[PDB]
Amino acid sequence: SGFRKMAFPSGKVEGCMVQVTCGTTTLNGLWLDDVVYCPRHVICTSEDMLNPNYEDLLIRKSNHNFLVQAGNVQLRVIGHSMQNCVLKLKVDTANPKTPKYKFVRIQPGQTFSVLACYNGSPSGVYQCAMRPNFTIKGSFLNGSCGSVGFNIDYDCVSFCYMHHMELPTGVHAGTDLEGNFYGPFVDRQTAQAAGTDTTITVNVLAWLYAAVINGDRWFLNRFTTTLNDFNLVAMKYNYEPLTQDHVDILGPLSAQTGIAVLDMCASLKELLQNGMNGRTILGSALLEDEFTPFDVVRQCSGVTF
Amino acid sequence: SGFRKMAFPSGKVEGCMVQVTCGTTTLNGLWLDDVVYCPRHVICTSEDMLNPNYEDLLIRKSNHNFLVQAGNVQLRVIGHSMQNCVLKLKVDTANPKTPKYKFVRIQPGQTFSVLACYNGSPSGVYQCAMRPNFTIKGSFLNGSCGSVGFNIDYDCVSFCYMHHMELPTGVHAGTDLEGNFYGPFVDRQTAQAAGTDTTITVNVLAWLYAAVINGDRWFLNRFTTTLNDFNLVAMKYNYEPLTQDHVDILGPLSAQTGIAVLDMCASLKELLQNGMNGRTILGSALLEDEFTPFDVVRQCSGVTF
Ligand SMILES: *CCN[P@](=O)(NCCBr)OCc1cnc(N(O)O)n1C
Ligand SMILES: *CCN[P@](=O)(NCCBr)OCc1cnc(N(O)O)n1C
Ligand SMILES: [Cl-]
């Protein structure tokens, strides 16, 4: 037993990370089959960032201006194109370590692992969630641009995030692997502020089920509630409204524990109204919301890849 | 920027994980060069666990009783021996994916990554610390026995932990890769209780420096303290006493931020005496102590492997 913030094993993706240089800018790219994916602002000078015209800047670039390096060996670029906010660099060699993979666009509230890289080399791995305001709370230093987020279903990596920028508030914004930003953000250095960081209610409930499975029980009470009454409390505390779809998705955790979903909502209600009174739940003094119901079942079941 | 609980990339170790079966017990082993390492209780029946005599139980086992499987392909066992609490199974094939590696025995307060596995297959990765009472707070289900903990220094994996058992309190105990348990624990199903889980003071201070570097500043005050006066407060709150060696190790973080170590101790003092008053630091409502000073510098610098 025990319950931890856990990332997927990173080996399958480590073998896909390369370094991309255009002019004086170096960041990371993702090498799958014979295509390397990277953020399009690799072509920008720091000046260009105030107001870049990416089509015009691309006119000045040729295949040989994109220096792609895989470990110690250089890849030959034989074509390049822009798809939304990413560049796709066609190389003459298929990545021999290409895993089975898919490109997915995730919904807010879903979780994924990030492999932070610098200069095409991995630095660490950690677990993130796509926030309701379409930011993520990551760890990205200079050179980390182009790191990707992913999930693994057995042997197939589903890529969902590529890192592009940090906003003045210290949170992070990026694209799916088709180059479309999550949320309203744009790859320009300008005034864009994140909206309300609401809490992912269904995830908090999954985590409370996880705590019960792992011996932390003190927060279970004698009460129940209804969706409409709980949601009045969720509104006040900037929690996502809970829907019947969320209730349904929590069914398996309800069954394993014998605690009805609405009973656990009543526990969450009291926790929001009274606080934790200095106590902890699974080693946290706040309510964690970056575990999905599927994450909990997975970790409490021992699924492998 | 941003600061996250980060594990090392797991690929180098994924390529070392195999499945070991003896009789009706299956767990994980670590395949380096032509030796597979695994917990010795793989030879035990559930009955034997009340009071096992490992030398006598080993008499009944031969090379061919240890079934070692690497992915879908079987390894041939050509020798076996017991070193303390691990078995070393000599196989006829050197692991072609063996990384540069070392076996290290870590000190309490040090941190490391765990690759949780079941049946020789990775499930996830997360970051741990060796607690002052020589337990770790992990996530280990049935079949997770034999998962290892490690650090990576550039290209060399330093293995420091192998998982053996869970104690009735839900915490975890294991060995170094020479088979010697951390702390006083023994591989028998019996009454062994963990001591006081004291907080790793030097790590909490590193993390406060990390917060300052990342914009969380509200806890800085106008006070300072001395080692002897701070330690009176540490004693009361079950914190490790702070030494001059710890102060020295925090020097680089002191220099980067311009905050003297003892000034930050005064901040920690007030946090212990007054609490966080409902506030948060780097997204936590308690004081985190599983980041080392080296972890912080690493993550705030972008070191790669
Ligand atoms: C990976 C982000 N690149 P960077 O230039 N430097 C690391 C910041 Br910790 O971040 C700023 C940036 C890059 N691109 C944009 N953009 O698309 O406007 N921004 C803001
Ligand atoms: C990896 C631990 N094996 P397990 O038998 N089953 C998973 C528990 Br979540 O744990 C109990 C165990 C195994 N070996 C010992 N021992 O050496 O006494 N114990 C307590
Ligand atoms: Cl917390």
Write out the DSSP string of chain A: ------BPP-HHHHTTEEEEEETTEEEEEEEETTEEEEEGGGG--TGGGGS--HHHHHHT--GGGEEEEETTEEEPEEEEEEETTEEEEEESS--TTPPEEEE--PPTT-EEEEEEEETTEEEEEEEEE--TTS-B-----TT-TT-EEEEEETTEEEEEEEEEEE-TTS-EEEE-TTSPBSTT--SSSS--------B-HHHHHHHHHHHHHTT--TT--S----HHHHHHHHHHTTBPPP-HHHHHHTHHHHHHHT--HHHHHHHHHHHHHH--TT--BTTBSS------HHHHHHHHHT---
Amino acid letter, B248: D
| Active-site residue, B41 included | yes
In whole angstroms, what is the distance from residue A35 CA to residue A93 CA?
A: 9
Separation CA B60–CA B242 (nearest Å): 51
Structural contact between residues B81 and B87, judged by C-beta atoms closer than 8 angstroms: yes
Does residue B187's CB lie within 6 angstroms of at least one atom of ligand 2?
Answer: yes
Say if CB A198 and CB A134 are below 8 A apart.
no
Closest ligand (CA of A280): 3
Tokens of A87: 């560049």
Q: Where are the beta strands (DSSP E) in chain B?
A: 17-22, 25-32, 35-39, 66-70, 73-75, 77-83, 86-91, 100-103, 111-118, 121-129, 148-153, 156-166, 172-175
Q: Do A144 and B302 touch (CB under 8 A)?
A: yes
CA of B120 to the centre of ligand 2 (A): 17
Amino acid identity, position A66: F
Tell me the C-alpha distance between A173 and A68, whole Å. Answer: 24
Residue position matching structure tokens 């026995």: B145
DSSP string computed for B90-152: EESS--TTPPEEEE--PPTT-EEEEEEEETTEEEEEEEEE--TTS-B-----TT-TT-EEEEE
Ligand of minimum distance to the alpha carbon of A179:
1
Question: In the 8-state DSSP scheme, what is residue B188?
Answer: S
From the list B140, B137, B88, the residue with the least C-alpha distance to B118 is B140
Distance CA B4, CA A296 (A): 20
Mutate to test the interface with A, among B3, B115, B139, B212 (most CBs of A within 10 A): B139
| Ligand 2 centre distance from Cα of residue A102 (Å) | 38
Nearest CA in chain A to B120: A304
Pairing label, strands A156-166, A100-103? parallel
Q: Please list every residue in chain B whose beta carbon sits closer than 8 Å to the beta carbon of residue A10.
A: 9-11, 125
What is the least distance, in Å, from the CA of B254 to any CA of chain A?
20
> A22 — phi, psi (to 5°)?
-135, 115
Q: CB within 8 A of A91, min separation 6: which ones?
A: A31, A34, A35, A36, A68, A75, A76, A77, A78
* DSSP structure class, residue B47: G
Adjacent-strand bridge partners of A152: A157
How far, in Å, CA of A175 to CA of A185, rounded? 9
Q: Alpha-carbon distance B282 to B206, whole Å?
A: 12
Closest by Cα among A171, A199, A206 to A185: A171
Name the residue with the closest Cα to ligand 1, atom 5.
A165
Residue A289 has which token pair? Answer: 């919301």
Ligand 1 centroid to residue A30 C-alpha, Å: 18
> Nearest CA to CA, how far is B120 from chain A (Å)?
9
What b/e readout covers A122-144, taking b as 16+ CB neighbours within 10 angstroms? Answer: bbbbbbbbbbbbbbbbbbbbebb
The Cα of A278 is separated from the nearest Cα of chain B by a number of Å equal to 9
First to last CA, chain A: 20
Interface touch A123/B304, C-beta < 8 Å: yes
Tell me the one-letter amino acid at B101.
Y
Resolution in A: 1.8
Q: How far is CA A54 from its chain centroid?
A: 26
Rounded Cα gap, residues B42 and A52, in angstroms: 62
- Report CB contact under 8 Å: B139, A215: no
Instruction: Fill in the amino acid letter for A248.
Output: D
**What are the beta bridge partners of residue A80?**
A89
Buried b (16+ CB within 10 A) or exposed e, B110-128: bbbbbbbbbbbbbbbbbbb
Q: Is the CB of A12 under 6 A from ligand 1?
A: no
Place of tokens 């906010």: A85
Closest protein CA for atom 18 of ligand 2: B188
Structure token pair of residue A97: 């370590």
Structure tokens at B287: 């004081």
| CA–CA gap between residue B280 and residue B267 (Å, rounded) | 14
Task: Name the amino acid, one letter, at A138.
Answer: G
User: β-strand A111-118 against A121-129: which pairing, if any?
Assistant: antiparallel
* Cβ B77 vs Cβ B31: under 8 Å: no
Cβ distance B294 to B158 under 8 Å? Answer: no
The length of chain A, given as a count of residues: 305
Please provide residue A243's backbone torsions phi and psi, each rounded to the nearest 5 degrees: -115, 170
Residue B123 has its nearest CB partner, among A15, A140, A302, at A302
Cβ atoms within 10 Å of A92's Cβ, excluding its own: 10
Rounded Cα–Cα distance for residues B8 and A14 (Å): 11
Pick the CATH number of A201-300 from 1.10.10.10, 1.10.274.10, 3.40.50.150, 1.10.1840.10: 1.10.1840.10
Chains A, B: CB pairs < 8 Å? 153
Helices B201-213 and B293-301: crossing angle in degrees, nearest 10, is 20
